Amino acid sequence: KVFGRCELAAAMKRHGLDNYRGYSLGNWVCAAKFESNFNTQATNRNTDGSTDYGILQINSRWWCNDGRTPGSRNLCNIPCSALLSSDITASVNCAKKIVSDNGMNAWVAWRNRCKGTDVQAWIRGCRL
Amino acid sequence: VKVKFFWNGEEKEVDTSKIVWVKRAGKSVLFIYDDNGKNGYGDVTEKDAPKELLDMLARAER
């Protein structure tokens, strides 16, 4: 599923991301934009053999199991395929673990495109 | 300070100034670093970890 911007904002708010670990909603929206273009089905291999999955491009080394990543920790206790669902529940819950030990510095798109910017712009005009 | 570790069998060295995220996992310390604007991953045992990396973990752990 490719979410619309405001559609995703509303879903992320309902899932409790607004101010999660001090990160306002726009941070999460902005990160999803630049990680996956709002596409739950996005996948991208890392040069190290791991793969990133879903709307927040969560990596297979530590968080989810894809069956082909050496040294998998599977800390979110899920198949990586769960991160591709139209229902964002698995991605949100896994993201919360990543940030609960720290912050959004885990996401390259957040460091590169979101941090230091007017991230509330990502939720302006939205019915929340 | 460099963090020396093996990743895909091969020897890596990363400056701690590039580390952006740190987490304890059992007897290991996991870290993400800025790799020329992408995420790089590593881990080292707490006993092998440079103290500068342990300092980062201590700050994270509040």
Author numbering:
A (entry chain B): 1 to 101, 103 to 129
B (entry chain C): 2 to 63
From the paper:
With the aim of comparing potentially different modes of binding, we also included Affitin H4, which was selected against HEWL from the L1 library, and does not display obvious sequence similarity with anti-CelD Affitins. The structure of Affitin H4 in complex with HEWL showed an unusual mechanism of inhibition. Unlike VHH domains or anti-CelD Affitins, the randomized flat surface interacted with the enzyme by covering the catalytic site. A total buried surface area of 1750 Å2 resulted from this interaction, to which Affitin H4 contributed 839 Å2. This binding interface is larger than Affitins with the extended loop. There were seven residues from Affitin H4 involved in H-bonds, including the non-randomized Val23 and Gly38. Hydrophobic residues were found which spatially complement the interaction interface, especially residues Trp8, Trp23, and Tyr43 which are located inside the catalytic site, filling the cleft. Residues Lys39 and Asp44 formed two salt-bridges, which sealed the catalytic site by anchoring at the β5-strand ends of Affitin H4. The non-randomized Lys39 formed a salt-bridge with residue Asp52, which acts as a nucleophile to generate a glycosyl enzyme intermediate that is critical for HEWL activity. Affitin H4 showed an enthalpy-driven reaction with a higher favorable binding enthalpy and unfavorable binding entropy, consistent with Affitins that bind through mutagenesis on the same surface.
